Amino acid sequence: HMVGQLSRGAIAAIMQKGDTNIKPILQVINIRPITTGNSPPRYRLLMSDGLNTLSSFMLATQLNPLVEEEQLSSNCVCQIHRFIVNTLKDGRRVVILMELRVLKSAEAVGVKIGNPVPYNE
Numbered sequence: 445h446m447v448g449q450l451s452r453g454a455i456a457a458i459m460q461k462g463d464t465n466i467k468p469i470l471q472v473i474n475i476r477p478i479t480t481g482n483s484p485p486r487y488r489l490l491m492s493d494g495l496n497t498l499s500s501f502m503l504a505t506q507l508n509p510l511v512e513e514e515q516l517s518s519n520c521v522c523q524i525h526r527f528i529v530n531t532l533k534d535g536r537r538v539v540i541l542m543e544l545r546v547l548k549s550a551e552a553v554g555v556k557i558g559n560p561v562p563y564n565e
Contacts, residue, residue, distance in 0.1 A: 447558035449521060450494030455563050458539060459498070462529065469523045469547065471557050473497060475511055487511050489541070492556070496563040501539045510546075519550035521557075537565075 454468035474490040485508065489501040503511065510516035526543035 447494035450492065450557060452493055452495040454493040455491075455496040455498050458527075458529070459537065459563060459565070464527065464529065467523055467525055468493060469521060471553070472516065472518055472520050472522065472550075473556055473560075474518050475503075475516070478502075484508065492558070492560040494558050495560055497560045498539070498563045500536060501541060504540055504542045507541065507544070515546055515549070516544075517550045519553045519555065520546055521548040521553055522546050 449469065450471055451466070451468035454466060454470065457463040457466060471492040471494070472489055473492050475487050477485050478488050480486050484505050486505065487503040487508065488499070489503060490497055490499045491501045503516075507516070516522070523545045524541060524543075525545065528540050528542060530538045530540060532538065
């Protein structure tokens with residue numbers, strides 16, 4: 445039961461309850477840069493808790509080297525130690541990952557775990 449490795453229900457807890465004290469274990473499904481002009485690059489992540497995915501995670505800029513040096517990448521499994529929620533003028537909520545541990549590398553996992561479905565909003 446690989447989905448047992450992930451914090452099923454964490455994404456709902458963050459989005460519905462506004463819980464910021466949990467330290468959920470999530471899988472990275474995809475990472476892409478976003479256009480930021482002549483500011484440091486910013487990375488957006490599609491994350492999974494085994495039950496849902498959410499596309500509005502952003503990495504804190506201080507952690508960019510983890511992506512640049514390929515340690516944080518699609519399929520890896522991470523424990524989030526600190527995150528903050530920021531709400532945009534249009535109402536979108538962004539989850540900014542501030543501190544985390546990579547528990548298993550992408551190549552040690554190999555695949556998307558389970559069949560998580562998109563969280564709407």
